Amino acid sequence: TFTTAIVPAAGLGTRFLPTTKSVPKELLPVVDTPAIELVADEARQAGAERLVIVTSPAKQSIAAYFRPAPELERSLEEKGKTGQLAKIRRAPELLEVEVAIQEQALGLGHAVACAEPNLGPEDDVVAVLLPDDLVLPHGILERMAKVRAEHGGSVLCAFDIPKEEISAYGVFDVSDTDDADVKRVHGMVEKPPAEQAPSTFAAAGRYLLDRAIFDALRRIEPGAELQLTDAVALLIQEGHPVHVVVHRGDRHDLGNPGGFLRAAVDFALQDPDYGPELRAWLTDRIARP
Amino acid sequence: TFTTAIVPAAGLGTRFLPTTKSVPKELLPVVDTPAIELVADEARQAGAERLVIVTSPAKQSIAAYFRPAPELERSLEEKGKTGQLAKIRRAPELLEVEVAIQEQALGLGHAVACAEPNLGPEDDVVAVLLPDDLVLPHGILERMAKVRAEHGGSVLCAFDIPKEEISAYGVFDVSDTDDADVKRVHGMVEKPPAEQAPSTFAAAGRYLLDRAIFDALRRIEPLQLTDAVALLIQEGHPVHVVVHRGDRHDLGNPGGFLRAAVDFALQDPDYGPELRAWLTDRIARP
Ligand SMILES: O=c1ccn([C@@H]2O[C@H](COP(=O)(O)OP(=O)(O)O[C@H]3O[C@H](CO)[C@@H](O)[C@H](O)[C@H]3O)[C@@H](O)[C@H]2O)c(=O)[nH]1
Ligand SMILES: [Mg+2]
């Protein structure tokens, strides 16, 4: 049912300095393809027709990536680079792309709130994809849509992480449903020590939010910032159904250079253009300092 | 010695499409640091005072990378990110940076030619660094400068590559000098089969070019830099090569780029041990 997916992209990417002084984090390549394209594609495959990218005035450049490049397409076609030509055609052809300008990076809730002018009356629910999380294979938003179909309200996403490894995450307080991968959300605890974690279900950056989230974001106490978790807790307090889908597949974390490199190596090893030679090189390389 | 280094950065990097549709190839990070900073640092360490980046109009944002970012700096200082603050201050403090515009990508020789208006009377010799080649450790240009001081003329750089591995490269035709790592260049053969390779010396992307190169570039038939060098040798200009014995990386395609990033990350304690452990498991399965 959702048609509009929101991608919050207004943070600098401090962890990727000095590169992110000049390059938007969301345009950095995983092998050859930027994360913004990877999340755009995932959104489209889940039925999004429209993408609202929230960013700063300085990173408006992310928009151009979704514009055609006619001269480049011609030059590739003339060199017989049909595979490269298909690669560059992919992102502009995925969906309709708009930008919402968040003047100052006041956090995720504020970013989602800044997308509301880009919504129309048909947007009763919106998908939100954080571009630092890659959730593999495609399809978590379709699982979350089934939960919305059944229960109404809003739907979150979790990874299943042992309590001794979960303390970097927000962690859901949950109850069971009839589906082992679907829980009712009662609340969330930020970065609990292992022995205080309410579950093994760590908050992942995929959301299906009912339009009620925007009214909730206007009614929560602003910070020093609008905390999306506070708006979700307000909905829960007011009886809005909130459930979570537990992702069982793989995932990558592009929020720091180390997790980014893991993603790129994992993908390159599966690509015949690179994999065999990379694997042979790695085998030798890891045996020395 | 030379004071001006030229970095030809006007080609797209078609092996990194679709990313390089929007992002200059030379700003792609090796772990966390763009290649253009790595080659600027190398140039500075060899005594460059000035960097002339040849780029297209869509890639002029390479320039802004070398400008101070006061508000970002102020913000990092207020957050006590001393290390990230140092990292952002590094590139702007290395040297004076100018941009020359190559309207179209007519090749390397043409990229070099387009830097000539940025040169002055002191520029008798210019360094050229190709930003897809990392030559490690720093110092090849200083070795090349010693050769220029002894012999005059121009100086090239070679990797010592076995004949059965050398066919992807241009391969110098050479004669000995009194230094094992310095050869006189008689010519170059493009991509020879192993049995036709005139040496084990493959051309690397580092150059110390006498100002005579510009006149050669004006007189070669349409431009390959190697043709302008060949014209110089024909006209009696001394050309030598220094053989690099050390390490190198190739950022020309994603595979070589990942080798560089993994190599550097394994040596950095922020990433190294966990990445090593992850790689150990990962390479044991498809
Ligand atoms: O019109 C152009 C074309 C290329 N370049 C730049 O020139 C550099 C080198 O171009 P590339 O296509 O990567 O050259 P190669 O095919 O790798 O070959 C060159 O670089 C090798 C070292 O890497 C040498 O062995 C070769 O003799 C030399 O021609 C790159 O940064 C390009 O951006 C420009 O600035 N403008
Ligand atoms: Mg090259």
Side-chain angles (χ1 to χ4, degrees), chain A residues 110-132:
Chain A
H110 196 267
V112 173
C114 272
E116 190 176 18
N118 297 74
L119 302 184
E122 300 317 304
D123 296 306
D124 292 335
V125 53
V126 295
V128 179
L129 301 86
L130 309 190
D132 288 351

PDB file of all heavy atoms in Angstrom, chain A residues 110-132:
ATOM      1  N   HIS A 110      13.582  14.794  13.325  1.00  0.00           N
ATOM      2  CA  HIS A 110      13.494  16.073  12.627  1.00  0.00           C
ATOM      3  C   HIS A 110      13.569  15.887  11.107  1.00  0.00           C
ATOM      4  O   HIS A 110      12.883  16.599  10.363  1.00  0.00           O
ATOM      5  CB  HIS A 110      14.563  17.050  13.136  1.00  0.00           C
ATOM      6  CG  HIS A 110      14.277  18.454  12.737  1.00  0.00           C
ATOM      7  ND1 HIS A 110      14.807  19.008  11.583  1.00  0.00           N
ATOM      8  CD2 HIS A 110      13.590  19.425  13.343  1.00  0.00           C
ATOM      9  CE1 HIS A 110      14.423  20.275  11.500  1.00  0.00           C
ATOM     10  NE2 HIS A 110      13.672  20.540  12.544  1.00  0.00           N
ATOM     11  N   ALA A 111      14.434  14.961  10.648  1.00  0.00           N
ATOM     12  CA  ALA A 111      14.551  14.631   9.237  1.00  0.00           C
ATOM     13  C   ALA A 111      13.251  14.068   8.679  1.00  0.00           C
ATOM     14  O   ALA A 111      12.798  14.550   7.644  1.00  0.00           O
ATOM     15  CB  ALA A 111      15.706  13.692   8.949  1.00  0.00           C
ATOM     16  N   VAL A 112      12.633  13.092   9.371  1.00  0.00           N
ATOM     17  CA  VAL A 112      11.354  12.524   8.937  1.00  0.00           C
ATOM     18  C   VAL A 112      10.271  13.611   8.895  1.00  0.00           C
ATOM     19  O   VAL A 112       9.550  13.712   7.909  1.00  0.00           O
ATOM     20  CB  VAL A 112      10.947  11.311   9.813  1.00  0.00           C
ATOM     21  CG1 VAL A 112       9.544  10.811   9.505  1.00  0.00           C
ATOM     22  CG2 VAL A 112      11.958  10.170   9.667  1.00  0.00           C
ATOM     23  N   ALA A 113      10.185  14.455   9.945  1.00  0.00           N
ATOM     24  CA  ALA A 113       9.249  15.566  10.047  1.00  0.00           C
ATOM     25  C   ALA A 113       9.390  16.524   8.860  1.00  0.00           C
ATOM     26  O   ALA A 113       8.377  16.986   8.330  1.00  0.00           O
ATOM     27  CB  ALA A 113       9.451  16.292  11.363  1.00  0.00           C
ATOM     28  N   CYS A 114      10.643  16.777   8.425  1.00  0.00           N
ATOM     29  CA  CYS A 114      10.908  17.688   7.306  1.00  0.00           C
ATOM     30  C   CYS A 114      10.424  17.121   5.960  1.00  0.00           C
ATOM     31  O   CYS A 114      10.328  17.893   5.010  1.00  0.00           O
ATOM     32  CB  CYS A 114      12.395  18.101   7.218  1.00  0.00           C
ATOM     33  SG  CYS A 114      12.805  19.561   8.221  1.00  0.00           S
ATOM     34  N   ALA A 115      10.156  15.811   5.842  1.00  0.00           N
ATOM     35  CA  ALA A 115       9.587  15.204   4.644  1.00  0.00           C
ATOM     36  C   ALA A 115       8.084  15.433   4.438  1.00  0.00           C
ATOM     37  O   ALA A 115       7.606  15.115   3.336  1.00  0.00           O
ATOM     38  CB  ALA A 115       9.850  13.728   4.640  1.00  0.00           C
ATOM     39  N   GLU A 116       7.342  15.858   5.478  1.00  0.00           N
ATOM     40  CA  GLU A 116       5.878  15.879   5.447  1.00  0.00           C
ATOM     41  C   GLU A 116       5.347  16.817   4.351  1.00  0.00           C
ATOM     42  O   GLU A 116       4.411  16.436   3.645  1.00  0.00           O
ATOM     43  CB  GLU A 116       5.269  16.273   6.785  1.00  0.00           C
ATOM     44  CG  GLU A 116       3.756  16.056   6.802  1.00  0.00           C
ATOM     45  CD  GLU A 116       3.065  16.326   8.113  1.00  0.00           C
ATOM     46  OE1 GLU A 116       3.664  17.005   8.966  1.00  0.00           O
ATOM     47  OE2 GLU A 116       1.909  15.855   8.263  1.00  0.00           O
ATOM     48  N   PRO A 117       5.930  18.016   4.099  1.00  0.00           N
ATOM     49  CA  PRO A 117       5.499  18.814   2.945  1.00  0.00           C
ATOM     50  C   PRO A 117       5.512  18.094   1.582  1.00  0.00           C
ATOM     51  O   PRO A 117       4.825  18.529   0.667  1.00  0.00           O
ATOM     52  CB  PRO A 117       6.482  20.008   2.959  1.00  0.00           C
ATOM     53  CG  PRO A 117       6.912  20.131   4.404  1.00  0.00           C
ATOM     54  CD  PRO A 117       6.996  18.686   4.870  1.00  0.00           C
ATOM     55  N   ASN A 118       6.300  17.019   1.423  1.00  0.00           N
ATOM     56  CA  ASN A 118       6.450  16.262   0.179  1.00  0.00           C
ATOM     57  C   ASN A 118       5.425  15.126   0.067  1.00  0.00           C
ATOM     58  O   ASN A 118       5.507  14.315  -0.866  1.00  0.00           O
ATOM     59  CB  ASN A 118       7.879  15.711   0.042  1.00  0.00           C
ATOM     60  CG  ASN A 118       8.899  16.826  -0.037  1.00  0.00           C
ATOM     61  OD1 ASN A 118       9.220  17.482   0.953  1.00  0.00           O
ATOM     62  ND2 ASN A 118       9.349  17.109  -1.238  1.00  0.00           N
ATOM     63  N   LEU A 119       4.542  15.004   1.067  1.00  0.00           N
ATOM     64  CA  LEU A 119       3.509  13.988   1.089  1.00  0.00           C
ATOM     65  C   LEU A 119       2.190  14.571   0.600  1.00  0.00           C
ATOM     66  O   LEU A 119       1.911  15.766   0.786  1.00  0.00           O
ATOM     67  CB  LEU A 119       3.361  13.471   2.523  1.00  0.00           C
ATOM     68  CG  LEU A 119       4.626  12.878   3.138  1.00  0.00           C
ATOM     69  CD1 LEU A 119       4.337  12.303   4.509  1.00  0.00           C
ATOM     70  CD2 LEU A 119       5.210  11.796   2.249  1.00  0.00           C
ATOM     71  N   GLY A 120       1.381  13.665   0.033  1.00  0.00           N
ATOM     72  CA  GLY A 120       0.038  13.972  -0.408  1.00  0.00           C
ATOM     73  C   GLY A 120      -1.011  13.168   0.355  1.00  0.00           C
ATOM     74  O   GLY A 120      -0.677  12.352   1.216  1.00  0.00           O
ATOM     75  N   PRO A 121      -2.313  13.376   0.044  1.00  0.00           N
ATOM     76  CA  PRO A 121      -3.404  12.718   0.764  1.00  0.00           C
ATOM     77  C   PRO A 121      -3.389  11.192   0.675  1.00  0.00           C
ATOM     78  O   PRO A 121      -3.945  10.539   1.549  1.00  0.00           O
ATOM     79  CB  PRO A 121      -4.693  13.248   0.093  1.00  0.00           C
ATOM     80  CG  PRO A 121      -4.273  14.447  -0.739  1.00  0.00           C
ATOM     81  CD  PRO A 121      -2.804  14.250  -1.041  1.00  0.00           C
ATOM     82  N   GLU A 122      -2.775  10.629  -0.384  1.00  0.00           N
ATOM     83  CA  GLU A 122      -2.667   9.182  -0.536  1.00  0.00           C
ATOM     84  C   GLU A 122      -1.604   8.555   0.379  1.00  0.00           C
ATOM     85  O   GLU A 122      -1.547   7.330   0.467  1.00  0.00           O
ATOM     86  CB  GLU A 122      -2.360   8.809  -1.991  1.00  0.00           C
ATOM     87  CG  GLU A 122      -3.413   9.266  -2.994  1.00  0.00           C
ATOM     88  CD  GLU A 122      -4.878   9.080  -2.597  1.00  0.00           C
ATOM     89  OE1 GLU A 122      -5.287   7.936  -2.276  1.00  0.00           O
ATOM     90  OE2 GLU A 122      -5.605  10.088  -2.571  1.00  0.00           O
ATOM     91  N   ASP A 123      -0.737   9.358   1.024  1.00  0.00           N
ATOM     92  CA  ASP A 123       0.334   8.830   1.864  1.00  0.00           C
ATOM     93  C   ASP A 123      -0.163   8.595   3.304  1.00  0.00           C
ATOM     94  O   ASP A 123       0.231   9.316   4.217  1.00  0.00           O
ATOM     95  CB  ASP A 123       1.554   9.742   1.822  1.00  0.00           C
ATOM     96  CG  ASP A 123       2.156   9.811   0.436  1.00  0.00           C
ATOM     97  OD1 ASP A 123       2.452   8.723  -0.117  1.00  0.00           O
ATOM     98  OD2 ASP A 123       2.312  10.946  -0.068  1.00  0.00           O
ATOM     99  N   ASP A 124      -1.001   7.565   3.497  1.00  0.00           N
ATOM    100  CA  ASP A 124      -1.500   7.187   4.819  1.00  0.00           C
ATOM    101  C   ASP A 124      -0.417   6.470   5.635  1.00  0.00           C
ATOM    102  O   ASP A 124      -0.492   6.434   6.853  1.00  0.00           O
ATOM    103  CB  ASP A 124      -2.683   6.210   4.748  1.00  0.00           C
ATOM    104  CG  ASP A 124      -3.964   6.787   4.176  1.00  0.00           C
ATOM    105  OD1 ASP A 124      -4.152   8.031   4.260  1.00  0.00           O
ATOM    106  OD2 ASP A 124      -4.757   5.986   3.633  1.00  0.00           O
ATOM    107  N   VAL A 125       0.564   5.873   4.943  1.00  0.00           N
ATOM    108  CA  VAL A 125       1.731   5.231   5.543  1.00  0.00           C
ATOM    109  C   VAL A 125       2.932   5.599   4.670  1.00  0.00           C
ATOM    110  O   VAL A 125       2.746   5.775   3.469  1.00  0.00           O
ATOM    111  CB  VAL A 125       1.536   3.700   5.617  1.00  0.00           C
ATOM    112  CG1 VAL A 125       1.157   3.074   4.285  1.00  0.00           C
ATOM    113  CG2 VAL A 125       2.706   2.961   6.237  1.00  0.00           C
ATOM    114  N   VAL A 126       4.112   5.711   5.291  1.00  0.00           N
ATOM    115  CA  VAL A 126       5.349   6.002   4.553  1.00  0.00           C
ATOM    116  C   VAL A 126       6.419   5.004   4.979  1.00  0.00           C
ATOM    117  O   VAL A 126       6.435   4.581   6.137  1.00  0.00           O
ATOM    118  CB  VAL A 126       5.799   7.478   4.749  1.00  0.00           C
ATOM    119  CG1 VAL A 126       4.794   8.429   4.142  1.00  0.00           C
ATOM    120  CG2 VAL A 126       6.099   7.884   6.196  1.00  0.00           C
ATOM    121  N   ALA A 127       7.271   4.574   4.028  1.00  0.00           N
ATOM    122  CA  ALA A 127       8.437   3.770   4.333  1.00  0.00           C
ATOM    123  C   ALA A 127       9.572   4.732   4.653  1.00  0.00           C
ATOM    124  O   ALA A 127       9.620   5.819   4.062  1.00  0.00           O
ATOM    125  CB  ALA A 127       8.814   2.817   3.226  1.00  0.00           C
ATOM    126  N   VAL A 128      10.421   4.323   5.613  1.00  0.00           N
ATOM    127  CA  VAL A 128      11.638   5.045   5.910  1.00  0.00           C
ATOM    128  C   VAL A 128      12.759   4.025   5.830  1.00  0.00           C
ATOM    129  O   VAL A 128      12.692   2.955   6.393  1.00  0.00           O
ATOM    130  CB  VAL A 128      11.566   5.794   7.248  1.00  0.00           C
ATOM    131  CG1 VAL A 128      12.866   6.526   7.558  1.00  0.00           C
ATOM    132  CG2 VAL A 128      10.357   6.730   7.332  1.00  0.00           C
ATOM    133  N   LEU A 129      13.830   4.327   5.051  1.00  0.00           N
ATOM    134  CA  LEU A 129      15.001   3.486   4.955  1.00  0.00           C
ATOM    135  C   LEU A 129      16.225   4.309   5.337  1.00  0.00           C
ATOM    136  O   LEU A 129      16.501   5.370   4.739  1.00  0.00           O
ATOM    137  CB  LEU A 129      15.200   2.979   3.525  1.00  0.00           C
ATOM    138  CG  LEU A 129      14.032   2.165   2.943  1.00  0.00           C
ATOM    139  CD1 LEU A 129      12.993   3.064   2.315  1.00  0.00           C
ATOM    140  CD2 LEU A 129      14.545   1.108   1.949  1.00  0.00           C
ATOM    141  N   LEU A 130      16.936   3.862   6.361  1.00  0.00           N
ATOM    142  CA  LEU A 130      18.199   4.493   6.696  1.00  0.00           C
ATOM    143  C   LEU A 130      19.263   3.899   5.786  1.00  0.00           C
ATOM    144  O   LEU A 130      19.500   2.685   5.773  1.00  0.00           O
ATOM    145  CB  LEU A 130      18.561   4.291   8.164  1.00  0.00           C
ATOM    146  CG  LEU A 130      17.467   4.653   9.175  1.00  0.00           C
ATOM    147  CD1 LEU A 130      18.013   4.640  10.600  1.00  0.00           C
ATOM    148  CD2 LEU A 130      16.794   5.983   8.871  1.00  0.00           C
ATOM    149  N   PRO A 131      19.982   4.768   5.041  1.00  0.00           N
ATOM    150  CA  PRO A 131      20.976   4.293   4.090  1.00  0.00           C
ATOM    151  C   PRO A 131      22.239   3.642   4.651  1.00  0.00           C
ATOM    152  O   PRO A 131      22.904   2.939   3.893  1.00  0.00           O
ATOM    153  CB  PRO A 131      21.214   5.562   3.235  1.00  0.00           C
ATOM    154  CG  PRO A 131      20.914   6.732   4.114  1.00  0.00           C
ATOM    155  CD  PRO A 131      19.849   6.236   5.082  1.00  0.00           C
ATOM    156  N   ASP A 132      22.503   3.750   5.971  1.00  0.00           N
ATOM    157  CA  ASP A 132      23.632   3.027   6.547  1.00  0.00           C
ATOM    158  C   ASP A 132      23.334   1.562   6.814  1.00  0.00           C
ATOM    159  O   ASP A 132      24.254   0.785   7.062  1.00  0.00           O
ATOM    160  CB  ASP A 132      24.138   3.666   7.824  1.00  0.00           C
ATOM    161  CG  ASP A 132      24.873   4.977   7.602  1.00  0.00           C
ATOM    162  OD1 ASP A 132      25.166   5.358   6.409  1.00  0.00           O
ATOM    163  OD2 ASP A 132      25.144   5.609   8.608  1.00  0.00           O
TER     164      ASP A 132
END
